[PDB]
């Protein structure tokens, strides 16, 4: 009923272990990502994470389904979701500069669903907290009405807050390396606390805003689109050369000069550098920075 109605389209292109596609489903544009079969694990535990009590939310891509399809020589195995067709935020922000209103969106329906992914719901149909873990630019998604969905959440983590269990044991270091906090690149995470999960989730989404504020153009000045620590490190970096930037050095991207004479964008700084402090546990949360956004959304 799902995969053997749904034709293949157009390649969108190769993941970490999947190949996207856009398909068609009843006359519908969707996303599809297929795995071969020595790709069981990856696929599974991808259709686990989507398949989650309660985490349906706005501002995560919207899973439609896990299937197979035996095409008469071998098995490849499905997952299907929503098309935005926009793309990721890194292509919007490649493609296009923002407003002030449009810069606040796109943070705000991110920490929006970032906050949704980390809280804990209570009650019979509970869901457990989720840290992502590989948080950028071009995991995030960007939907008709201009606001911001989280994707690939394949490498995440669940707690289950009974037993004080995560519900894989993580094998250290899996994101992108220029987005790793400074506690992933010189091995210091506790990873029997799951909060530490959270805080690098948090400083990643730093740079994310960043990434944002950049391409926001008032009155026609603007910066073009660079990935943070675009200066520092070259466009393929090993762990220790990010180490070495971010923990020996100590070094975050530029904030601009510009960013002081506008309230939005002052907001913003302040908010990237509470993201970006070494020690995580005095980082802001995304609740916080989502109530903070909404504050500033409505002036
Ligand atoms: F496909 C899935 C099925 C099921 C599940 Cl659980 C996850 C995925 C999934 C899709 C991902 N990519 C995309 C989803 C929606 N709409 C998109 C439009 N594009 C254009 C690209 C052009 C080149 N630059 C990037 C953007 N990509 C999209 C990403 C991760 N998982």
């Known amino acids: 009923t799902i995969a053997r109605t749904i034709v293949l389209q157009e390649s969108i292109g190769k993941g970490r ?11 519908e544009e969707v996303a599809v990502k297929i795995f071969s079969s ?29 299937d197979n399809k035996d095409n008469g020589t071998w098995t490849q195995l499905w997952l299907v979701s929503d098309y ?7 292509d919007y922000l490649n493609r296009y500069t923002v407003t002030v209103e449009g810069m606040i969106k ?11 992914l980390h809280m804990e719901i209570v ?12 948080l950028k630019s071009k995991n995030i998604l960007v939907k008709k009405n201009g606001t911001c969905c989280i994707a690939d959440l394949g490498l995440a983590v669940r707690h289950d807050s009974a037993t004080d269990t995560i519900d894989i044991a993580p094998n250290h270091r899996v994101g992108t390396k220029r987005y790793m906090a400074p506690e992933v690149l010189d091995d210091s995470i506790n990873m029997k606390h799951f909060e530490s999960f959270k805080r690098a989730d948090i400083y990643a989404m ?3 805003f960043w990434e944002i504020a950049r ?7 603007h910066e073009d689109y660079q990935l943070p620590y675009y200066d520092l490190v070259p466009s393929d970096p090993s762990v220790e050369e990010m180490r070495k930037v971010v923990c020996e050095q100590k070094l975050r991207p530029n904030i601009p000069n510009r960013w002081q004479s506008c309230e939005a964008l002052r907001v913003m700084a302040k908010i990237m550098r509470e993201c970006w402090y070494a020690n995580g546990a005095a980082r802001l949360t995304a609740l916080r920075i989502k109530k903070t956004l909404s504050q500033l959304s409505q002036q």
């Open 17 to 27: 272990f999947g190949e996207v596609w856009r398909g068609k489903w009843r006359g």
């Open 38 to 66: 020595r790709e069981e694990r990856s696929w599974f535990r991808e259709a686990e994470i989507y398949q989650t009590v309660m985490l349906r939310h706005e501002n995560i891509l919207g899973f439609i389904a896990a």
């Open 84 to 90: 935005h067709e926009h793309g990721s935020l890194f």
């Open 106 to 116: 796109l943070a705000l329906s991110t920490a929006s669903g970032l906050a949704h």
């Open 123 to 134: 009650g019979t149909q509970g869901k457990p907290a989720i840290a992502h873990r590989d």
């Open 206 to 208: 730093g740079l994310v």
């Open 215 to 221: 391409r926001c153009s008032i009155g026609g000045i």
